[PDB]
Design a binder for these strands. Structure first.
Ligand SMILES: Nc1ncnc2c1ncn2[C@@H]1O[C@H](COP(=O)(O)OP(=O)(O)OP(=O)(O)O)[C@@H](O)[C@H]1O
Ligand SMILES: [Mg+2]
Length: 971
DNA sequence: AGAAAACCCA
DNA sequence: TGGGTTTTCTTTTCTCT
RNA sequence: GAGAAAAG
């Protein structure tokens, strides 16, 4: 649309506003105004930018100059131009307070002053100055009184937003002053954009070469520090020259940040660089994005937004603190908005070519700025100052000359360095009051996770009724308000294995040592295994370094959504959706007493973690727990020196943590009045099958995946495993070798993924790879036939064909056909969840202007079922919040304290009915016939999709209220 | 690799 | 009708080219 | 970009 130079100079003038430097903008405006080619292609917005800037300084003569320049070249003043004019007229006492010409022309122009105060975004201080100007004269003007905020009136969301009800909202265990101090700590950790952590490695004792290298790097880094402060000042003068000669320049972009912070950034980029050099454009985009983030943090420090955030957060903590009482209790978004919400003043990203030019300029400073001696091993040897990194040609990756990387490797630097946003928050996160504001204090966290800069996700989120997202945001805040701590005993044991030779049986990666050590094939395989082990140990190193950092601290994990609705915590390395070790390290910081029923749920949780007794009732899982109590107590007491019963569990570290918790609870004097911090888990049987069976009301499926009450749990995977094992015997007696070598190897775990995936649009090749990976990890299985057996295991699993999951397949076929026809119409598949969240699919494999019908078709049934179980999770979260339950969730795995597992069940058995009492299939049908089938050009295609959508398959005969008495719906 | 057919563009 | 490409969906981490 | 690994 607009020219690239227009956006480029718009970014220039905006950054000149943000960095004082206003005579530079006036000079460039004058130079462009002189030349006829240059005075063309300016929009009104750049003169408007210089308008508000001279309004901030209040220079009346200069602003009258640029206002006179507005009328030339056919630009009439817009609303905000008049606003800045009112701001400068009121900044002085001119025109008897701005009415003598400005307000008369304001009324003559036909631009509404109400529309100025409402429609057009203004700064709050500028808005107050306009108020003072238009209050010196005309005192009969007053601001329109803003209404009380709207309260959502949907059927599922009536109960959570009904004012008259008995509520018990949970409060944190931390007082107001402690939470305020943690707010200060988080603010300091976010202003300093990186955090340094100690390695969990074994440290190296002082040696001659190690400390010689250690003092060599300090001298070289200080030398490059002075070199970088030379180069950036030289290019600052050189770019100010281009400003003063009438050229575009990046001079305010380098004055966005101080000299020091840029040099520190470039040094941290060298410290974080691997032995192999990274792509030049990737280094550029990383550097310029870091410049943007540090600018966003710096602008709030200068502009006074940080102090406003301080006062509001100190008032907001009264809701969460144990020692403070809000007069009427309410939700954190509601209490945030009831208090005066600060203006966001959203920093917007610059145009992408300007970002790339900044990254190129910084990286090309970094290339020709740093130098080092070549004679590293011999300091007395005379060597010229060899460039440390010239590989710009090369796909283009810079070269770390091997002296530097060997110097680092013999330096034994004990410190890793993280981003602020890659670390758990030290204070409770900001409430999700908007798709813009939430999670981190000073960083623009996104509502939906996305890649490659897909922006239609937000464009659906900001085009909604304002009360639609209220259910989702209050869910994410509830997921973010969970207080976590680190289980230190598990950390001690894992670091004991990590600092020694690792234990790959229990998940601790092996060192570069104990690696495997005609000939070429074996050497290549040894190098491959060495690289994989080194990579896994680097991952575990980073995770355990954050865990040891947060060992003594209470931290919060802010949550985002994806597009389809499911919720993930923002800090990546150490979260509760990670592996066995990561879940074993994490624990609830707030603890709730067990009560009369908590210890039974702890024991059932332990038996669920062992992986034994999956086919059993709860009474016999509990009887198993009493059977193996001595093994539990020995595993808790002697993990690595006892009989190691916990190691044989399917999730050994979580089993060990639960063994410790159960051992503390049993040996307690009153196990009912024991404060338990362990998250007890409840999981759906087959949630794709659960939601398909509840949509189709299929009695056979509902009985099959436990929507109908039964004494014993029912698994589809154990059914199909025996149903293919009978043919494994029947073909083995015909003398087939592939059936003969699979004896004792047809389990739930090898067919679990395939029968999980049959309800989605799976092909036989994907099922083949699915069983193939599981057969590769089978050590007892001979590895020769792993390919062949995989084919034999996607054959004979046609047992799902014989009228198995029938209404499931009808629902699947209609969703698949709907996605196919929507995409063949040319449109992307969108739908609104029953809680109101709009969902769009970012597939678009044109290059991105057509929808990829294969990807849309294969994506619609999983994305829709994930939307439903995310909505079910959010309803369960909200109605547990009304009953004072601490709830988190790994994507159908609902986690809470043991004392709440009954209540969490009941809400899970209520909001599954209340969600599925609504005609989700019919509401989806009418939404997609209104949104997608109302076009004039494609009446026949709309008729075909109309016949498809209006032929939603009929519900079966299953009363959903039975789910209320289903014991093993979630177990 | 390879056992593998269906969909999309010629 | 003939030839090329994918293979159910999402999320996350690490070192080597 | 491949080498892997993890969660639903
Ligand atoms: N590989 C996968 N592909 C698609 N969806 C998946 C996949 N793995 C899990 N899911 C989704 O996650 C949920 C199932 O999680 P989970 O791993 O607990 O499976 P399950 O069928 O409930 O098995 P289990 O018997 O172990 O409880 C469903 O919503 C399902 O759609
Ligand atoms: Mg499960």
């Amino acid at each position: 649309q607009l020219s690239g130079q227009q956006q480029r100079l718009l970014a220039f003038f905006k950054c000149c506003l943000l960095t004082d430097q206003l005579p530079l903008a006036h000079h460039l405006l004058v130079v462009h105004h002189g030349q006829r080619q240059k005075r063309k292609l300016l929009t009104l917005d750049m003169y408007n930018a210089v308008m508000l800037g001279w309004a901030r300084q209040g220079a009346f003569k200069e602003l009258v100059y640029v206002l006179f320049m507005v009328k030339d070249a056919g630009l009439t003043p817009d609303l905000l131009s008049y606003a800045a004019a009112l701001q400068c007229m009121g900044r002085q006492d001119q025109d008897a307070g701005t009415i003598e010409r400005c307000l008369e022309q304001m009324s003559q122009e036909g631009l509404k002053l109400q529309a100025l105060f409402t429609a057009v975004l203004l700064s709050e201080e500028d808005r107050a100055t306009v108020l003072k100007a238009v209050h010196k004269v005309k005192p009969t003007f007053s601001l329109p009184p803003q209404l009380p905020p709207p309260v959502n009136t949907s059927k599922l969301l009536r109960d959570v937003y009904a004012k008259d009800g008995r509520v018990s909202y949970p409060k944190l265990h931390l007082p107001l002053k402690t939470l305020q101090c943690l707010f200060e700590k988080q603010l300091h950790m976010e202003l300093a954009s990186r955090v340094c952590v100690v390695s969990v490695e074994k440290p190296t004792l002082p040696s001659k070469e190690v400390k010689h290298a250690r003092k060599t790097l300090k001298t070289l880094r200080d030398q490059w520090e002075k070199a970088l402060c030379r180069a950036l000042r030289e290019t600052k003068n050189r770019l100010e020259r281009e400003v003063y000669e009438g050229r575009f320049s990046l001079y305010p972009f380098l004055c966005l940040l101080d000299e020091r912070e840029v040099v520190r950034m470039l040094l941290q980029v060298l410290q974080a660089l691997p032995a192999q050099g990274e792509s030049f454009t990737t280094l550029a985009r990383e550097l310029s994005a870091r410049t943007f983030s540090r600018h966003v943090v710096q602008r709030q420090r200068v502009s006074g937004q940080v102090q406003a955030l301080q006062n509001h957060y100190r008032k907001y903590l009264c809701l969460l603190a144990s020692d403070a009482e809000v007069p009427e209790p309410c939700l954190p978004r509601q209490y945030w908005e009831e208090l005066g919400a600060p203006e966001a003043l959203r920093e917007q990203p610059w145009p992408l070519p300007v970002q790339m030019e900044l990254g190129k300029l910084l990286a090309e400073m970094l290339v020709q700025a740093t130098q080092m001696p070549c004679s590293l091993d011999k300091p007395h040897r005379s060597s010229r100052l060899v460039p440390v990194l010239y590989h710009v040609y090369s796909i283009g990756i810079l070269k770390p000359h091997p002296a530097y990387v060997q110097l680092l490797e013999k330096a034994a630097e004990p410190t890793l360095t993280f981003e602020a946003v890659d670390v758990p928050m030290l204070c409770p996160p900001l409430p999700w009051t908007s798709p813009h504001s939430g999670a981190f204090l000073l960083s623009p966290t996104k509502l939906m996770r996305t890649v490659e800069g897909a922006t239609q996700h937000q464009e659906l989120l900001e085009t909604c009724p304002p009360t639609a997202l209220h259910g989702a945001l209050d869910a994410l805040t509830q997921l973010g308000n969970c207080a976590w701590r680190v289980n230190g005993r598990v950390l001690d044991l894992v670091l004991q294995l990590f600092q020694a030779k690792g234990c790959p049986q229990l998940g601790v990666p092996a060192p570069p040592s104990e690696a495997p050590q005609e000939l070429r094939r074996e050497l290549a395989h040894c190098q491959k295994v060495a690289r994989e082990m080194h990579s896994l140990r680097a991952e575990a190193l980073y995770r355990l370094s954050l865990a040891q950092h947060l060992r003594d601290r209470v931290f919060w994990l802010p949550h985002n959504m994806d597009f389809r609705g499911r919720t993930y915590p923002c800090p990546p390395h150490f979260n509760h959706l990670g592996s066995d070790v990561a879940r074993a390290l994490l624990e609830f910081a707030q603890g709730r007493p067990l009560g009369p029923h908590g210890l039974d749920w702890l024991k059932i949780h332990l038996v669920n973690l062992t992986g034994l007794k999956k086919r059993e009732p709860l009474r016999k899982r509990l009887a198993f727990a009493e059977e193996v109590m001595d093994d539990i107590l020995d595993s808790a007491d002697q993990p690595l020196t006892g009989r190691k019963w916990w190691m044989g569990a399917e999730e050994p570290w979580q089993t060990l943590a639960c063994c410790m918790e159960v051992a503390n609870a049993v040996r307690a004097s009153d196990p009912a009045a024991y404060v338990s911090h362990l998250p007890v888990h409840q999981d759906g049987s087959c949630n794709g099958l659960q939601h398909y069976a509840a949509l189709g009301r299929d009695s056979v499926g509902a009985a099959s995946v436990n929507l109908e009450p039964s004494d014993v749990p029912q698994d589809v995977y154990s059914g199909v495993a025996a149903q293919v094992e009978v043919f494994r015997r029947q073909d083995a007696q015909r003398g087939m070798r592939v059936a003969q070598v699979l004896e004792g190897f047809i389990t739930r775990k090898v067919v679990k993924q395939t029968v999980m995936t049959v309800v989605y649009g799976v092909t036989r090749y994907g099922g083949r790879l699915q069983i193939e990976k599981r057969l590769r990890e089978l050590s007892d299985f001979p590895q020769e036939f792993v390919w062949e057996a995989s084919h034999y295991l996607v054959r004979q699993v046609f047992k799902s064909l014989q009228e198995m999951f029938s209404g499931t397949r009808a629902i699947q076929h209609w969703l698949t056909e709907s996605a196919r026809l929507i995409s063949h119409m040319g449109s992307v598949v969108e739908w609104v969840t029953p809680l109101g969240v709009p969902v769009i699919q970012p597939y678009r494999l044109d290059s991105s202007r057509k929808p990829n019908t294969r990807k849309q078709k294969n994506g619609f049934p999983p994305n829709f079922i994930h939307s439903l179980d995310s909505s079910h999770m959010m309803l369960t979260a909200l109605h547990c919040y009304r009953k004072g339950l601490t709830f988190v969730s790994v994507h159908d795995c609902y986690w809470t304290h043991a004392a709440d597992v009954s209540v969490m069940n009941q809400v899970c058995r209520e909001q599954f009915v209340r969600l599925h009492s609504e005609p989700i299939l019919q509401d989806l049908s009418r939404f997609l016939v209104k949104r997608f089938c109302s076009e004039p050009q494609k009446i026949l295609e709309a008729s075909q999709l109309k016949e498809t959508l209006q032929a939603v398959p009929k519900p079966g005969a299953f009363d959903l209220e039975q789910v209320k008495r289903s014991t093993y719906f979630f177990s």
